[PDB]
């Protein structure tokens, strides 16, 4: 089982490397944007976790979508989403964006970002507090711990 | 990797000159001219070679193909290879092969001359007591003796400034 064990440790290596940093792009429409800038605050640091806020979309690993996503917003959202590399994850933050929520019975408003992008981490709250959002990002990293990607390529 | 290393770098030099003489897109031509300038600097430093090729390296490959790529960026488009370009590069490769063939498997090449075709380690100094790298004091002579020469050179450069701004809309 020498090849299986060394490929398993190799998969652990690359999964640990991906779950290390994950510097996103911070999309941030409405007041959930202010809550993201306040989980950049000194009480809760992103940069303890390799998480650098940077709006460069070509080198963005995950993407937090938050704020009130509108029908006038959505095509530019998916055009941002296409030019983003295949290791990609979507964290839907906030009661506006994770299912419509408060502006749910309203024209020109997308009924949550399930209908636009594939969604990985739902985090509710209004605003979802920095503790809750940081808990969601650690749970995202534990999803990265449970991936078995290179094992599937091995026994494929 | 043999004795004729200056001749080899000269072959690569003529390769680069043919490579932008084939009329490519102008930034590919600038790339070919940059490789040509690098190997020409290599040749002139191989013949010793203290200052001059590193001096031109700032000038042409430090301040002229910059402006070539600059004007290629701002003016021309290429907004949508060709048989003539690729055929001319084949003719350049083949004529270099023909000249190198008449060097190697014959005595020499004569066009209207007498080129003694052998390795260009000759001619060279027999290790004289230089002690000051005679290129350096040679270029130092431009300020010891150059009364008229730097005056007309700097005056032409001032004229270059005023002519450039006038043609591109002085004042």
């Amino acid at each position: 089982s020498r090849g299986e064990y060394v490929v398993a440790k190799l998969d652990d290596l690359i999964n640990w490397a991906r779950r290390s940093s994950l510097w996103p792009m911070t999309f941030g429409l409405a007041c959930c944007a202010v809550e993201m800038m306040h989980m950049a605050a000194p009480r809760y640091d992103m940069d303890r976790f390799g998480v650098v806020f940077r709006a460069s979309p070509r080198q963005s690993d995950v993407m937090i979508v938050a704020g009130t996503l509108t029908n006038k917003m959505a095509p530019a959202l998916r055009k941002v989403y296409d030019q983003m590399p295949e290791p990609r994850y979507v964290v839907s933050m906030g009661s506006c964006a994770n299912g419509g929520g408060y502006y749910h019975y309203s024209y020109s408003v997308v009924r949550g970002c399930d209908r636009i992008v594939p969604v990985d981490i739902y985090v509710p709250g209004c605003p979802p507090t920095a503790e809750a959002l940081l808990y969601g990002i650690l749970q995202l990293q534990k999803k990265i711990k449970r991936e078995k990607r290179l094992r599937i390529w091995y026994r494929r | 990797m043999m004795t004729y290393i200056v001749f080899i770098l000269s072959i690569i030099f003529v390769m680069g000159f043919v490579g932008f003489s084939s009329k490519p897109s102008p930034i590919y031509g600038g790339l070919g001219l940059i490789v040509s300038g690098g190997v020409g600097c290599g040749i002139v430093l191989n013949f010793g070679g203290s200052f001059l090729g590193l001096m031109v390296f700032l000038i042409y490959l430090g301040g002229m193909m910059v402006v070539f790529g600059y004007t290629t960026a701002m003016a021309t488009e290429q907004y949508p290879s060709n048989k003539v370009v690729l055929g001319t590069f084949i003719t350049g490769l083949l004529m270099e092969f023909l000249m190198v063939y008449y060097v190697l498997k014959d005595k020499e090449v004569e066009i209207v001359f007498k080129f003694n075709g052998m390795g260009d380690w000759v001619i060279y100094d027999t290790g004289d007591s230089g002690f000051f790298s005679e290129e350096a004091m040679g270029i130092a002579a431009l300020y010891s003796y150059g009364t008229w020469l730097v005056i007309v050179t700097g005056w032409s450069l001032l004229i270059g400034v005023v002519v450039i701004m006038e043609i591109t809309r002085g004042n």
Partner: protein, 144 residues
């Protein structure tokens, strides 16, 4: 004075338990301010309160290995805490929870089953509703 800081700053590692005790908590995440030993509780977890640091770093917790059989030596979760220490640890209160932990009510769980999404054992939604309009049954007795 620099040799009085190194002499003071080496004692909390030497008083941590040695070197391989401090190896565990340093490779785990961060904790270096050990030395108060307020309370241990179920899932073996340890609760350390210092008053000398600022408000926010009073009350910290060290988790254990296999609290419910998940190999939680690494990758500690939130909601791995019992609820009375969850009152103590967010500083909604300022009383230790070992003064009055329980309630005298026999319906409260003993597990505190943690974050379960992403397992073979998680939650689904459904309709807690009985029969809607009671669709008709054809005559199963054989007529004709």
């Amino acid at each position: 004075e620099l040799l009085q800081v190194l002499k003071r700053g080496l004692q909390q590692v030497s008083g941590h338990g040695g070197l391989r005790g401090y190896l565990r908590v340093l490779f785990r995440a961060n904790d270096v301010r050990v030395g108060t030993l307020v309370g241990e509780d179920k899932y073996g977890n340890k609760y350390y309160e210092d008053n000398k640091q600022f408000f926010g770093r009073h009350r910290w917790v060290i988790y254990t290995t296999e609290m419910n059989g998940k190999n939680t030596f690494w990758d500690v979760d939130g909601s791995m805490v019992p609820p009375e220490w969850h009152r103590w640890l967010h500083c909604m209160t300022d009383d230790p929870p070992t003064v009055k932990p329980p309630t005298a009510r026999k319906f409260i769980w003993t597990n505190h089953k943690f974050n379960l999404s992403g397992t073979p054992q998680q939650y689904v939604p459904y309709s807690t509703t009985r029969k809607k309009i009671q669709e008709w049954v054809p005559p199963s007795t054989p007529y004709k």
